[PDB]
Structure formats: structure tokens, C-alpha cells
Amino acid sequence: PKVPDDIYKTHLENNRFGGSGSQVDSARMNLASSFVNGFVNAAFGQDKLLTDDGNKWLYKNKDHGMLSAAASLGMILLWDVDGGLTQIDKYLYSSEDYIKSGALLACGIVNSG
Amino acid sequence: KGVLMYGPPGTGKTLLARACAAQTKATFLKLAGPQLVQMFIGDGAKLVRDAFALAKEKAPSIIFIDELDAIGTKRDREVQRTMLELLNQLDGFQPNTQVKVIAATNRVDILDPALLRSGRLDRKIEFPMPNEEARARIMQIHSRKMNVSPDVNYEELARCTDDFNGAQCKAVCVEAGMIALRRGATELTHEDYMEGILEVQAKKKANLQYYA
Amino acid sequence: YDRGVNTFSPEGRLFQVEYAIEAIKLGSTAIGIQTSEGVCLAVEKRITSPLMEPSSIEKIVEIDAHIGCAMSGLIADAKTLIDKARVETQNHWFTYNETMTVESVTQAVSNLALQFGEEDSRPFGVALLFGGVDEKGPQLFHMDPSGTFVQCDARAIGSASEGAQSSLQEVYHKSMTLKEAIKSSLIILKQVMEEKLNATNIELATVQPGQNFHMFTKEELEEVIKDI
Amino acid sequence: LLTVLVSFLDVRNIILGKSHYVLYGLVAAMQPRMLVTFDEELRPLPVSVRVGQAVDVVGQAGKPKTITGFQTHTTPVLLAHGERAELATEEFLPVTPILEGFVILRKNPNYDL
Amino acid sequence: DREIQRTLMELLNQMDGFDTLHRVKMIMATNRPDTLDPALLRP
Amino acid sequence: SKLPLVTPHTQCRLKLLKLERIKDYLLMEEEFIRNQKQEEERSKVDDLRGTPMSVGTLEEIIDDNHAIVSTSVGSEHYVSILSFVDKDLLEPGCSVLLNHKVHAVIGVLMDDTDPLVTVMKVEKAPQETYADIGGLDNQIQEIKESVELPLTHPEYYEEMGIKPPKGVILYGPPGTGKTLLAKAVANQTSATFLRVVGSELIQKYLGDGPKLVRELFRVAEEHAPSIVFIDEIDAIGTREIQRTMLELLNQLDGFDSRGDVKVIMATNRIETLDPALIRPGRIDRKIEFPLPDEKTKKRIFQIHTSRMTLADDVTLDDLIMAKDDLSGADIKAICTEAGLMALRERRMKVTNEDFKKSKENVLYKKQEGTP
Amino acid sequence: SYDRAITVFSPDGHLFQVEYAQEAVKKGSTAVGVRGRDIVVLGVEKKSVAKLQDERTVRKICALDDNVCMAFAGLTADARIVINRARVECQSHRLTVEDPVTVEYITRYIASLKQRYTQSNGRRPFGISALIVGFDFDGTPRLYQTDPSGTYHAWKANAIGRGAKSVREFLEKNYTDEAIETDDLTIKLVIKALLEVVQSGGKNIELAVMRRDQSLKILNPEEIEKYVAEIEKEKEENE
Amino acid sequence: IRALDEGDIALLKTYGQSTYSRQIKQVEDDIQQLLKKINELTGIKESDTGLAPPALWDLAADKQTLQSEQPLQVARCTKIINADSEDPKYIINVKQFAKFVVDLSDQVAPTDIEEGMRVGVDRNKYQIHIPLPPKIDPTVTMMQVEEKPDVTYSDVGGCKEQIEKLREVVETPLLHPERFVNLGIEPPKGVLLFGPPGTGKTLCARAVANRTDACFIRVIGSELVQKYVGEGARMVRELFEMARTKKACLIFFDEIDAIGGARFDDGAGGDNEVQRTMLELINQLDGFDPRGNIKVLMATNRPDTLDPALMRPGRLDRKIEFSLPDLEGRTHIFKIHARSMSVERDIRFELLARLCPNSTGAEIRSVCTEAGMFAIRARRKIATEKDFLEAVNKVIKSYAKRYMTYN
Amino acid sequence: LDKQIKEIKEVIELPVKHPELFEALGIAQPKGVLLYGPPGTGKTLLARAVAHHTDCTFIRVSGSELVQKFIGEGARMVRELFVMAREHAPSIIFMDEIDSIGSSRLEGGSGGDSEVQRTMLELLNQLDGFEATKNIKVIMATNRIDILDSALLRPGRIDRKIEFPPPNEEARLDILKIHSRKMNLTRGINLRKIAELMPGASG
């Protein structure tokens, strides 16, 4: 599974936004990264970013990102209904509510098609 | 009023011209043959004439020409024009006054009939392949500042450096200094001199089965 | 300075027979090794098609029951040189009844090679390797179109002779058994020249002082193929 | 697609605003592009095929079968837009003479050695 | 190269303009007379 | 922009339907266009550049907004640069618009000089496609792997860490389709196509050869994704001409990084090529174009006779048969001359005998010599 | 130093004039010879009888021995010259040597003649190649080819001339490693090769057969057409 | 057969039509005419100008400067009269316009103005006020590399001695002048690179340019060879002046065989002009006046062809030989090329090296690439030893490529 | 030249005047015609007449004019000749005495040409590449066709050949009448006898 940062390949460009002015988990680019992880790693049933750091990455997003980022997992787990459906449970009972909304949509989006 | 100095490349031709500029205190005109070529048809004659006029105005003046064969080739058309202008601003219709020319080249066979006339370049100074003692003197001159070893057999170096030119001997000294650096030695020695000689020398081609 | 050997260049080199060395280069390679046990020659056929009879290409020949030959260059001129070497051996033996020294065979072939501008055609565009035995020692020799010849212990001629010669130089020493020298030659020819060994495009010929029979290697390469 | 595309008409409010999740509508269109060949048991059967663009050439109001500028690829192979594949050898017969998606093959009995 | 021939034409024309009365004379000096165009060499 | 390609060619109502579809769409264009602010920006800039504006050449840039400009009278002026001019679009030799009164730089003009290479930029590849060529499949895959795939999908090579191949030679008897294949690959990937015919780079002027090849590579790299074709490379391939060879070889292998421009070179006498120009480092792909075989010949006959009206009696196999005696260009010649022969006897529907005598006459005109 | 001659070498060592002789041979018509299990067969094509021409006079197949035969392809004047030399050599060898002629000896003689003709100034080389088939390989059939470079080789089956590139591959396509049983089968294969004629008609192919013990045998057009019919019947099996 | 009478073509193009002919050709003419109507209706396409992003530019400062400053003309200065040195007076040359006698402004100073010096001048008084840099020929100044290639010395394989000896001359004195000066030695100033094509000479030049840190100028044979006489010599003059402007500089000539050809005369004058250019160069490298801190690199495939004066030490002090790589060098370059790829870990490269004949490094990169295409055509994401052996076979047999002249 | 004029009328006029048939037939139009015959046999006259009637522009460049004294000029001049050909659009290109460059080339010695062949192969590429063959045709004339080579004659290249034999009795009559039409003849003139008394006239 590819990494959104690696798709951006910030490791090679001249990162002209860096040092002091990059040390924040700001909402917008985090939502972009979650969408990229969902799209690029869609249907492959696995991820390295939002599987090991599943809860942790969610904790650093905010507001509508939770409804988005969690649902992102559903695209990775496409048509393995018993795959995603065993993976969304940890978020089906999440303390967070917006990520619960994202997970409750990911459950359905896994069954799409 | 004309001195054509010549020899194989590697002798002291340009060095001797530079020394003459250094010591004679004259208003010295240094230049190379291609400088007078130029693009437009009538220009080359104009530079030649204007350089001679400037030499006239600076009266105690010396004109040095380097690489005659660039324009001095025997019979393009403009290079011919430039060298004709040089010929007649130097030999015909009241030359001399106090302008002296010095000429340097490696291909005297190329120039033949036009410039080499006794009237134009009165002296023809051959620069020979430097002699054994001459080669030793050249290496000593170039190695003065080298802080060489107190025992360096310059005679043996000259013996091994047959066919070597003065520039090649200077390269031998420089290469000996480089090899002394690669050893980290604070003063270069004789063995560095054979190593430099091996560096400067040719490749000896290869054994040719033709003759065996 | 292009018409023939009768013209001298400013450097003295005749600008006709350097092209004869280059004609040596265009030919397929040949390898020769001189050992105390025996003298061996290896040769590549450069076989155009299997429909060819591989033995029809006479790039490995038997000069006499005590001397074999390989060569590189032009095949017709090589065959003419081989024919002369054979008739020279025949005549000298029939007259004097003493064995022809291999060096003498090289001398005779070289003396023929000196017949393009030395009497009254063109240099023989082929270089030869001889491997023979005699009453005083087993020898290997090489000669070229120029008519010069030399005693070699391990020589390579023809196309890509440089790499094969370098490998042969690196593997050779004065105390090799003929088996180890042969095997080194085969593995070298396999790695650098074309491919794995096979009877269709490679040939071997060995000579021993006490063996005037079966001067070649034939229909027994099998034991090599599995154990190479 | 159509939901996402009509939504994007007010991108500041819909997508850049409150409703990023709307993008997930394209998962309703989620379909992979490939060829996978099976035998009649429906187990995978890797088969050499001829892949390339589609033109009619010598087909004028007739046969359009022309895989032009083709490569030889052993199945499975991905099929970008405009790509077509044809059985490289007639040793098989396809169940359906439209080689897109999952297809099944059978041994040709009419073909003889 | 072109202007050389154009001015040579002017040379021929102008010195063909010498009227018999004129007290003007011509001397040309050269070191390679062969290169000279035969145009001048004519009577 | 251009029209779509209608791909029935027989006169059928499918062709019609495609046509009136196109007419519908263009008529909507007409409708829409017939059924019919920034004055602040204009009033500042297009009034600062008070009409008229002269056209000159930029020589050097000295300060952030100060540059030297020459004009057609040849004079040189140190002038200022107004802020709206794109500095990155300015370089020595660039054509620049200037205020008439104060010669101030007021913008870059898109280049309209270097006429000859501007003409050889052609870009007029769309007359053919991989469709138009049949049977050259091995060659097609080879050139696709060498030049077409790195342009369309350099991702494979970058992911593999591979620097893509950087030179292709096509060779074979003439009329085998080398030029056609080059034009076809230029059509498949719409990268800019550059063609220059062999001897035409040989020039009387001493500099013009290497200079011409230098400017051609300069324009090629300027267009960035580009393919340059040198047909009959033999004319140069087999001191001055050798110096043009050295220039081309160094433009291929030498200093700097070339980037994306691909090189196709077609020869009829490949064995006469000098070793230097066939660089193993650069030219790793040599593609032979053999004389077409039975299958390829059949494909070429179908391709060329496809657009012609044919009778029933034509048995293509007797035309295909015998041996590999001829190439695709000869096949086109047979098709054309059979068309003329059918025309003389007043057939608009060519028959088998037409092709038979056509191939016979072509083989007569093919080669010559006393027995 | 380019070629310009016969006895000088290019700087890379190649003699260009022998290559030019090879090209002159390449201009000639097809000639495909084979040797079978016991018999040797030959078929020449492109007769092209020009109506007023009578084909027999040209003699595209010539026999110069008690038993050996084939012409030499290229320029037919050199072919007739070498024909006369082969007649003289075979008769002289049979008269002078204790035992009769063998195919290897005559092949070597022709190769040496070509070489000695090439190896001199002012002597134009014979630009003709040939395919020699003989009987006395100790009572076995065998085939040789002769190349204007003064060179000779021993083929199981070879082709020279206009179809040299093609028919050879055809041979490489189907020269059966099984020795051809019923050498009539090898003759049918030769007829199939002759179907690749310059005119490809097959109605004017001149064929010779010699069973390594027999004398020269000549195949008439009708009986050769019989083998052509058998080959066509074999070809029609693809249905 | 009689020629096509007008009735014959009429019936030919009438009887043979389908029942569609009229409609579809008429519709095609409507295609063309409607296209032309669309083109005339939309008008011509706006060619536009520069005009950087709108928020970036203008300000009233633009118009204020336009109406306040002066569009200075450019003039060659000459012959400072200096009649009394209280007001010196100067001569200026406005190209193809005129020649004037002028004075300085209230801003500039006499020390700021020299002879020549390419000064600027006002448009009506022609008073001199700006110090301008000299005219460097554009086709000479674009020759400066301005961008380092992505190659380091570690990418060069096998030639340890060659890279060491070349860095001794082109890199060490610039990096560590102290070693030479405190030992009191003058380092070499000219290095020639020679060897067979494709051995890595231009690669070594790229590595040097990447590690130079000083002003690096590439030079190609075609650049020097102009058409007009003396012009190439002129460009080399300007190039050496440019090199003198930089605090030290590196000059690289690629394939100096293009110009350095040995002088010959009997060929009806020969090329001559190329000889004149290389003669101006041979003077610039070492003639009158010291060259300066200019270290120079030449690489050529024909070392013997260059004129002996160019081979001469003092201008070409150190000559380096790039021979065909040895077995160890072949292994090293195979490693270097295989670094970038996605391959098997267990590729026994020294095997591939000993399969290689006397192959140049260009051949090594070629076979590595051919393995890359083998892997890609197989669609595998890992190149295997089988791919490398097919690549070796392909490259070697391709280079090897009737031939009955053999044995 | 009625037979010759009818053949050339077909080959040249029929494509330019009636392209549709070739579009209807699908075959590309023939590119050019070669003319051969003894000098003075109205070859240039006939080509000029065809240029006039088909309303296409006439451009003439002789093969002797092609040679030039410098390499790289014949190629340039031929390519730009076809540049004028394309920019004039419907036109015919004449190469009178193309055999001057379509001739035997020096096969080694104290010198060589190497540029006649180069101009030949440049023209050969230009007409082989059918460069914008829309209403553009080429025509060449050769004296004694035997000296010409088949390089330009190879099938996909120039397609048709025309022979211009010396005028016969009737042709001599026609030429006499045509040229003497302006002349002031006198009663008693019998041009038939003059035509008979001139066997093998060259026109």
C-alpha cells in the first residue's frame, strides 16, 4: 500500500514549507492525505498508515474529516465484506462520534458493487 | 627590423619574447596571428595598419607577433589581404623609423615565400631542441623554488630526458612536485624526478611486429 | 602509399600488410598451448548452419603424424600454406629420413610467405599456429603473413584475440599437466568467445612425443561435456 | 459520477465546505479494468493474448476486429481506455467473443495438430 | 570575396577611361603574377 | 483542433449518420456563437504600453528591472523593465516589445524567428497510424519499448530505476516502411515530430551542418516531449562531414542532460555505417525491416486495396505467392497501377487480371541487366 | 586505401573484389542441390524459353565425368570455361591416376583453380558458384559447394543464387534429420523447393538424379510434373 | 485505347456511384464551409504577451519610473582625453549611429570609468551615467553550464588512478591551495583525457562539473566552428576573458579532435580556418600574458590527431588514459549501474563481468538497460539474473552482428 | 506527337483535372513522368503545352543547373525548388536533362564527385516521400535514355515513361506547316517534297 506522502514524494522535492512551519497536523492536508490513502490504496484490502495507526491518525484529524477519513478505509477494503466488516467494528463502537459517522458509511461502501 | 624566432613547440620562444618585453622597458605590442583575421572584408588590413601607426606614435615601440602561420600561410582571401598589409607596412615605402617586430611560429615551412624575405625578417633565430646541459639548466631554473633535495642528479635527469622540450622539463619538475605531495614529503627527491619523467614521457607506442 | 608493399611510408611502415594483420583479425580465433605433456590446439568453427558438415571446414588440420596446425584468417590461403607444409614434410622425410623439426616447417611456410614482392602477388592473409613434437622437444609456434614466426607457449590468434590471450596468459604456467591446460582453454573459450562447448563448432587436436596416431580429438567429447 | 459532478457546481460549500463525503459517490462507479481468463471450471488460466488499440482498417461497414500496435502479454493484463485484447493463438475458443473483464476459455476441438 | 571582384571591375573600367591626353601612369607590383586575372593581362 | 475520423469508408449510411452527427455539432457551435470588466487592468498596463509598441531583441539583463535591448536600426539601449513582464520568459535573443517613446521593456513576444527549423517542425504526422501498417509486429514492439513506452509511461522505467534507451536505428531495404513506422509512432504518441532528410544537413557552409543539428536539438528540447527523425542517415552516416558526425554523436551521448527527446535514424546501408555513430551506449536498439513475407504481403495488399472498389474474381493469393521479391512500396505501386489499368479499359471496379498484369509489369520494371 | 583492385586489402583487411564476385553470384538464378539416403537430385529453374529460343542449347545442367554433373551459376561464360577445365581435369585424372576420379579431388581442383585465378593482378576471378554431386564417396552420395573465393565445402543440402537466403532457410525448415527413405521423397522435396522458382511456375524445371552407382539420370517435364502433383497432394492435406 | 472523353469520365463518375454520393459529398462541403464560418465567427486567436499574474505587478511606481528615468543608449567608451584631469572628456561610439565627445554625470566618478568599458549614456545630451558590464557574446555566455549534472565520482567505476590524477589538477588546487603554496609548487593547469569511445570520459567531465564548485564551462567542437573567418577565434577570446572574470574557472572541451587537427598546408590551404581557431586557442592557453587561474580539460577519441603544440605540456600538462575496463572495473561499474534498479539481491555480477568481452562502460550501461527492458517487457518488478544473461547475449551478439572470408 | 500527347495528357491532366476518380478508385495519383528521345524532339515544348492547358504553373530547373560547385547546395536547391512548387500549389516541375545528374558516377581514382549522387538521392527522397502531392507533378527529360539509371525509375517512384522518336513524314509535314504558318510563302511551294528530302529530321 502506497503512502500519500510518498505519492506527493515530499522526500525528494525541495520542501520550501518545512522546519518550523510544518510542525502541525492541520485539518485540510490531513483530509487530503486520508482521501489519497483511500483512493490509491483502494480495494487492496490493506494499508500501512491507517491500519497500524488507525486510531492515532484519526485522533489528529478534526470535524468533517472524521466522517471522511474513517469512511476512507471502506475504499481500501472494497468487496472484502468480511474484511472491512471485521475492521470497522473497532470504530463501530468508537468513543468519537464523527468517526463513528464515517465508519457507519464505510460499512456500506464496502458492500458497494 | 625583422626577427622571425622559431622552433619546435616546447622551447623558450614565447618565454624569450616575454622576457624581451620585460627587460627592454619599451612600449610593447603583444598579439597573436588570429587576432588580425576578423570577419569583415577590409578590417584586417585596418588593424594591421593601425597597430603599425600606434607603434609609430609610441616611437620606442616593439611589435610581437605570435603564431605567424595563422596568417602567414603561403598562397580564404581576407587572411591573404591581412598578411599582405603586414608585409607592406613592414618592408615597403619608408618603413623602420623606430619600430622593431618579433615573429614566432612552429611551422616555418608553411610561410615560405611571402614574409620570410631577408628584407622583412632580417634575423631568423632557430630555437633548437634543448641540449643536455640546456635541459639540466631548464629543470634547475624551474625547480629553484621547489625546495628540492640537496642531492638531485640533474645530469642523469637530463640524460633520461632526451627529446624532452623545455616545457616538458618544466612539466617534469611540476610532476615531481605533485608526486612529492602524493608521498607527503616536505621536499622532493630524485625518485620523484624519475617518476615525473615517466609521467611526462610519451607512450613509446607499442612493439611493432613489422620489423621485430 | 596504398598501391602495394613496394611503397614506403614516411615512418617506414608498408601500408599494405598492416591490412594483412587486420585480415588476421577478421578471421575466427585459434588457441594453442605448449605443455611438457603435450602441445594442444583449440579452434572455433563459426558454423553457419547445421546442414554444413562441421568437419568440412578445415580450420584444424594434420600437417604430419607428429605435427598439427590451426590458423586464423583467409581459409584458401591457409589451405595453400598447409599443403606446402605437408609436401615439405613429405619431401624432407623421404630424402633425409630425419623428422622435420616443427621450427623448420615454420621456416619453410614463412619462406613461401615471402613471395609477394620479393621475386620477379599479395601477402597471404592468414596467421598460423603449429603444434608438434620431435626428438628434441615438443613445441608450439606462431607465424603471420609478414613471414616472421615465434615460439610461443600459449598463443591466441584471430577475432577477439586480446581477451582470450589475456585469459590464456593468466591461466598459463610452465608446470601444467595437459589435462588442466586443456580444461582451462575450454572454459576460457566457453566464457569469452561463443557459448558452451559442443562438437559442432569447436575442435581440439593434441600432440604427444610418443603418439603418432589419433592426432585429433573426435567422437569422445562426451566425457568433457558432462564433466566440464 | 453524476452526483459528485453536479455537487461540485458549488465546490466552496459542498466539497471544500461541509460535505467531503460526497466524493465517495464515485465508489458506486468503482470497477477495475483487466482481463482474467478462466477455464470452464472457472479456475484462473494464464493465456497469451494480443493487446492494443482498436481500428477498422480494411473493415468498411464490416469486421472491425483490429488490435493495432499490439503487444503479446500473458493474462492477466490491465486494459486502459481504448485497449482491446484478442486470443494470440486459436488453440482456445472464448465463451464470448468480447474479451473484456472476466472471460472463460475452452480447448478448441476443431483445431487439430 | 564578392567586393574584390566588384572593385576589380571598377578598376578595369576606370583605367580603361584613360584618355590619350592624360599624363597619368600605372605601376602594379606583385610577387605571384600567376594569380592575377588575365583580364588585366590583356592588351 | 481537427475533425473526428469517420471510419466507414465504403459508401454506407453509417458514414452518413456520422457525418450528420458532426454537422449537428458544428451547427450548435454556430448557433451558440451567434447568440451573443477589466478596464482597470487595461487602463493601467495597455495604456502604459502606449501604442504603437516597437519590436526589438533582448541582449542582457543587468538588474531586476533593467536590461539591454537592441532594435532593428541596430542601436543599443539600457532600458527599464516594467513589473508585469515575466522575467523567466526573458533571455538573450528573445524578441521584446518596447514602448515607442522611452524604449522601456513592456513584454515578451512569442518567437517567430529561426524559420527553417520552424518549418521542419512539421507536426503534421496525422496522415497515418499503427493501423496503416500491417505485419511489422516485432518492429512495432521494439520501437514501442524503446521510444513510445518511455514517452507514454516513463513510470515503469523510473520505478525500475532505469534510464530509458536513448537512440534507435531502423534499417532494411527501401520501401519496407521505416519512414511509415516513424510517422506512425509520431502519430500514436502526440509528442512533437521532427523530420530532417539526411543529405539536407550536409551544407556548403562550414558551420551550417553542426549548427543546423545543434539548433534542431535545441528546438526539439524546447518542445520537450519530441521525436526527431533522420532518414537516410547514410548520407552523413557512412573532416567537415565527420565534424557534423561528431556534433551529432556528442549531442546524443555528450555533456548536459538531454531529457525527453527521442531519436529515430533510418538507413538503407546499415553495414556501411561508421562504428562511432552506432554507439552501444546510445544506440542500443537496431530494428531490421525485412522484405515482407507471405502474411505481411497479404496484410499490405488488404490495407492498400481496401479503399479500392474490387470485383469478385480477384484471387489475392496468386498475387501474394511466389517469394519475398518485393516490399510494401512496390505493393502500393501494384495497387495504383492496377487502378490506372482498370481505369483505361473503363473499370471503376478493378479485377484480378488487372493486378496480374500490374505485378508482371512492375516485376519487369523491377531491376534490370543483360542476361 | 579503398579496394580499386584485386590484390590490395582495405584498412580493416577485407578484400572487396571477392565480395563483389559473391554479389555477382547472388545476381544469378536459383540452384538447390541435396543428397539423399542413396541418390543425389538437382533441379534448376527459370528456364524462360523465349518462344523463338529453344531451351536445350543453353545446357543449364552439364555432366563432366563418367559420373558427375552440375553447371555453375553466375555468368555462364565462366561456367563454360570451368566446364572445359573440369572435363580436362577429370579425363586426365582418370587416365593418369592408378584409380578413377573422386568428388573430393575434383572439388579441390575447382577450388584451387578459382584461387589461383584470383591470386594475381590483371586476372578477373571466376564469379560463379557451383554445387557438385558425386557418386564415388566410397560408394556413397555426398554434396559439395564451390565459392568464387576459391573455397569448397561439403553440405548435406545447399542452395545458391537468387533464392540462396530463402531456400536455405526452407532447407533448415524441413531437411529431415531422418535420412530420406524412398529417395523419391527427397526428389519430391527438391520439387517443392523448385516450386519457389524465380517464376514459381514449376512447368520448366530441369531435374537430374544419380543414385551414387548409376550414371547421369535426367527427369522429363512430365515425370517431374508427376512428383509436383504428389507434392501438391501432400500440400492439400491441410484440410 | 482511346483517351477518356468528357462523357466517359462523366459516366465513370456517375454510373459507379452508390445512391448516397450526392448527399455525402454535399454534406462534406457543408463540413468545410461551416468550419470556415466558425473560424471567421470566433475570430483569430489572441497571441498575447507577457503580463505576469495580475496581483504580482504594476503599482504606480511603474509609470512613475517610466516618466522619471531615462532610456539610456549604450556606447563604447574610448580615449579619455584627460587634457587637464579636472574635466577629462571622453569619446563614445554609438554603434551604427555616431561618435561623440562627452563628459561624466554628477553621479558617476572618473575612477568609475575606464577606456572601452561599454558605458551607457543619455539620449539627448549624451552625458555618461552608468557603469555597464562588457559585451559578452550570447553564444559564448550560454556555454556556462549553470546547472550541475547528477553524477558524482562514486558513479565512475574502475578508473581510480584516472580520477585521482584528474582531481589532483582540476579539483585539489581549488579546494586546497595551501598544500601547493606552502610546499611552494605550481600545480598543472591542463589535463587531456583520451581513450576509446564510451569509456566514461564525458562521464568524468560531468562528475568534475558536479564537484567543481567553481565556474564550469563546457565546450563542444560545433560551438567553436563558425562559418565566418576569425569568428571562432573571437568566441574563444571572449570565452577566455569570461573565464578570467571568474575567480578561477574550469574549461572543458569535449572531443577537441573537432578543432585540434594538426596543421597541414599542401592541401590547397586545407581547412585553415579551423586551424586558425585552434591557433588562437593554442595562444590563449599559453602565449603572451599569463593564462590566470584557468584550469582546462580536454577529452578526445583521437589523441594522436591533435596538433603537437596542443599536446605540449604547459598547456596540456597531464594526459590520462581511459582504457577498456578490467575485470575488477567491470564488476565495479556493474555494481554502480545496478544500484539504481530493482533487482535480485543475489545477482552474481562478477560472473556477468567475466562473460563480458573487452566491453566499454557504455556497453555495461547498455546491457544493464537491456536487462531493464527484459524485466519490463516481462512486466516483472524485479530484474533477474536470467534477464541479465539475455541482455548480455543481446548486446554482445548485436555488436558482433557472405562472411566466408573467415576461417 | 499525337500518340505521345495523348499518353501524357492522360498521365498528367487526368489526375489534376479529374482527381475524383482517383479518390473514387482510392489509388493515389501518379507522381511524375520521364521523357526520353533525341534532342530537339519537342519534349520541352510538349511539357510546356501540358502545363499551359492544365492551367497549372510551370517551373523549370535543368539537371545541369543542379550540379553547382559546392556540396550541400544541390540538396538545398532541390528542396527549395519543391518549396516553390508547393507554394505555387497547382504546378508542374521540369528537370530538363536530368541525365546530367542521372549518369554514371566516378568509381574511384584521383578524385570523385559524390555530390551528383547526393543531389540525386535528395530529389529521390523528395518525390519518393510524395511531399504534399496535392495538384503537384514533376516531369523530366533525358537525351538517350540508355545513359540514365533506374534509381528514379523504381516502382513507387516516377511512374510513366514516354518516347520521343524522330518525326516521321507526317510529323515533318505538321512541323513544317506549323512553323511556316507565319512565313510568307509563294505559290509553287511544295512542302511535301522538302519533308521527303529530309529523312531522320530531329523536329
Ligand SMILES: Nc1ncnc2c1ncn2[C@@H]1O[C@H](COP(=O)(O)OP(=O)(O)OP(=O)(O)O)[C@@H](O)[C@H]1O
Ligand atoms: N630554455 C628554457 N628555459 C626555461 N623555460 C623554458 C625553456 N624552454 C621552454 N621553457 C618553458 O616552456 C614553457 C612554454 O614556453 P613557450 O611558450 O615559450 O614555448 P614555445 O616553444 O614557444 O611553445 P608554443 O610554440 O607551443 O607556444 C614555459 O613555461 C617555459 O618555462
Ligand SMILES: Nc1ncnc2c1ncn2[C@@H]1O[C@H](COP(=O)(O)OP(=O)(O)O)[C@@H](O)[C@H]1O
Ligand atoms: N508494412 C507496410 N505497411 C503499409 N505500407 C507500407 C509498408 N511497407 C511499406 N509501405 C509503403 O511504402 C512507403 C514507405 O516506404 P519506407 O520504407 O518508409 O521508405 P524509406 O525506405 O525511405 O523509409 C509508404 O508509402 C507505404 O505505403
Ligand SMILES: Nc1ncnc2c1ncn2[C@@H]1O[C@H](COP(=O)(O)OP(=O)(O)O)[C@@H](O)[C@H]1O
Ligand atoms: N567507468 C565507468 N563507470 C561508470 N559508468 C561508465 C563508465 N564508463 C562508461 N560509463 C557509462 O557509459 C557512458 C560513457 O560515455 P563517455 O565515454 O563519457 O562518452 P565519450 O566517450 O564521448 O566521453 C556514460 O554515460 C556512463 O554512464
Ligand SMILES: Nc1ncnc2c1ncn2[C@@H]1O[C@H](COP(=O)(O)OP(=O)(O)O)[C@@H](O)[C@H]1O
Ligand atoms: N513536333 C514538333 N512540333 C512543333 N515544333 C517542334 C516539334 N519538335 C520540335 N519542335 C521545335 O523544336 C524545339 C525543340 O526544343 P525542345 O522542346 O527544348 O527540344 P528537347 O525537348 O529535345 O530539348 C521547340 O522550340 C519546338 O518549337
Ligand SMILES: [Mg+2]
Ligand atoms: Mg608560443
Ligand SMILES: [Mg+2]
Ligand atoms: Mg527540350
